[PDB]
Structures are given as C-alpha cells and as structure tokens.
Design a protein around this ligand. Structure first.
Ligand SMILES: Cc1cc(C(=O)NC2CCCCCC2)c2c(c1[C@H](OC(C)(C)C)C(=O)O)[C@]1(CC2)CC[C@@H](C)CC1
Ligand SMILES: Cc1cc(C(=O)NC2CCCCCC2)c2c(c1[C@H](OC(C)(C)C)C(=O)O)[C@]1(CC2)CC[C@@H](C)CC1
Lengths: 143, 143
C-alpha cells in the first residue's frame, strides 16, 4: 500500500464516540474520544493528522462521513484526496477495543484508556512495531 | 541532540492556553489549545505524544509544570524521564504565533488556526522540512 493512505472510522464504547485513524501500510493508529460524531470533529481531526504526517488520501468504511462541507473544506486546505483503490467488501477497531478493556480499570476516563491503548498498540512487537514501521516507510519514501 | 528529547511549554493567545511541544533535534512541533493550564491537561497531552513518538526525555522552561502527581504518573506509565542536559539561560513559540496571525482570519476558532499553523510549520522548506527531518532522525536511530 502507498505510504500516504489513511483510513478513518468511528466506533462506540460506553456511550461515547472514538475516532480511529489507521496508517494502512504500517498498522499505526491514532485515536481520540470525541463528544459528537460530527463533520466538525472529523474536519478538525483531519487537520491535526495532516499537520503531523504526509496524508495524501483518506479512506473510510462509511462514505457518508465525508459529505459535510466542513470536512470537504478541511481536505481541500490540506490537499487530501479521497481514496478509491480500496474496494469495500462486507478489524483493528475490535483489536483496539481489546486493549482498552485490558487497561480500562487503570484510568478513570475512557479517553485516558484510549490513549493508553494507542500507546500499547503502536509499540507492541509484531519484528518491528507499528511506530517503527511508519517512520521507516515514510522515511524511505522521502528518498 | 538526542532523538528522544522533547520540550513542552504553554503560551497564551486571545485569553486561551496553547500547549506547544517541540522535537528539539528536528524542530517538529505539535500544539493544541487546552481549556486550562493544569496538570491533568499536561498529563493527557504527554500520554498522547508518547503513544505516537518514542519520547524518552522531556524538558520545559517552567519546571513547576511537572510537579503534579498526575503528570508524574503519566511520565511513569509511559517511561518518560526529565531532561537534565539542557541548561536554562534567560523561540518557536513566537514564530508559531507569527504563523497563527497570518492564517487567523481563515478560521473561526483559534484551535483551528493553531492546527493550520502547525501544518504550515512542519511542512515548510528550510533542504528538508521539519516533518521530513523527524522521521529520518527517528528512522536512522532505529538502525
Ligand atoms: C483524572 C486523573 C487523575 C489522576 C490523579 O491526579 N490521581 C491522584 C494521584 C496521586 C495519588 C492518589 C490520588 C489521586 C491520575 C490520572 C487521571 C486520568 O486522567 C487524565 C489523563 C489525567 C486526564 C484518568 O483518566 O484517570 C492518571 C493517573 C493519576 C494519569 C496517568 C494515566 C497513565 C493513569 C491515570
Ligand atoms: C467551525 C467551522 C465551520 C465551517 C463550516 O461549516 N463552514 C461552512 C462552509 C460551507 C459554505 C459556507 C457556509 C459555512 C468550516 C470551518 C470551521 C472551523 O472549525 C472546525 C475545524 C470545523 C472545528 C473554524 O474554526 O472556522 C473550516 C472551513 C469550513 C474548516 C477547515 C479549515 C481549513 C478552515 C475553517
């Protein structure tokens, strides 16, 4: 997979919304609890992500996520296009919920447990970790 | 400078608080508006940062920032130590305020303009950009 492709999806836990972004080529994840599943939260999240990584295309399992003018304006400003090379055929959201449950009792707030789970996931040895693979993929792509 | 050293500081604009983290070796920045200048916001921010980058030591220009038990617990869990190799002698916070002012009229909310400014800063050509330098520094360090 190309080094600039990211997938964004929302999942639900404890009555709250978790926005999950996956760097498809490496398995690296960024995730955050958001108050509402809205175009404004999505747009703000995409702007943050694009300022930290070289985001070229974005995919999702719910295409209606990207219909708001707010999201479109954010993609426009950051130069993000929609991904079309990933067919929809009806993963880590469940594996991420697994880690959250493992650490949930260590934190009061769900948003804390989510970041603990992101940390665990990105640094776990699978023989590099996801965090190691993304930087080497993007670094190699620069050259 | 070592590839795992980050500097964290808060600055103020429009009556709000902006938390600014700098990867000292590359100039790469992450920044966010936070509601209050509190140990809980600092701790949560450090947990997010450490799950995304290999954070080994953290420095600051206001040492009292790191006295709360909440921050200490976060550093403990993520394995972060305090940096001692950067003497205090009384930069980018001003350069970042410069970019914010340049784009401020393009967004309603300050928090949006901040992320726009982070994007501009990390992708500006200075002949690589900060975003390119951090990944190559960390990738080279893995090997
Ligand atoms: C709200 C809250 C409060 C405290 C706190 O001040 N506890 C004191 C400690 C001193 C001795 C006992 C008296 C109680 C702590 C956390 C949190 C956490 O929320 C934030 C991320 C800070 C926003 C949460 O969601 O629970 C930690 C540990 C300490 C943060 C680090 C993390 C790995 C584990 C959870
Ligand atoms: C709150 C808000 C609302 C709208 C919006 O829905 N405008 C519509 C567009 C359709 C046509 C005119 C009618 C009005 C827009 C933004 C924001 C922004 O706050 C968030 C990041 C989304 C949380 C802000 O702080 O202003 C953007 C552009 C569009 C986001 C992208 C960014 C590069 C520039 C600012």
């Amino acid at each position: 997979c190309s080094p600039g492709i990211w997938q964004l999806d929302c999942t639900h836990l404890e009555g709250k919304v978790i926005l999950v972004a996956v760097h498809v080529a490496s398995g690296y994840i960024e995730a955050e609890v958001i108050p509402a599943e809205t175009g404004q939260e999505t747009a703000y999240f995409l702007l943050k992500l694009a300022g930290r990584w070289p985001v070229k295309t974005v995919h999702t399992d719910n295409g209606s996520n990207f219909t708001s003018t707010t999201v479109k304006a954010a993609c426009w400003w950051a130069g993000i296009k929609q991904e079309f090379g990933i067919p929809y055929n009806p993963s880590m959201n469940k594996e991420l919920k697994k880690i959250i449950g493992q650490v949930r009792d260590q934190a009061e707030h769900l948003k804390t447990a989510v970041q603990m789970a992101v940390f665990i996931h990105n640094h776990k040895r699978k023989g590099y970790s996801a965090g190691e693979r993304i930087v080497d993929i993007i670094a190699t792509d620069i050259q």
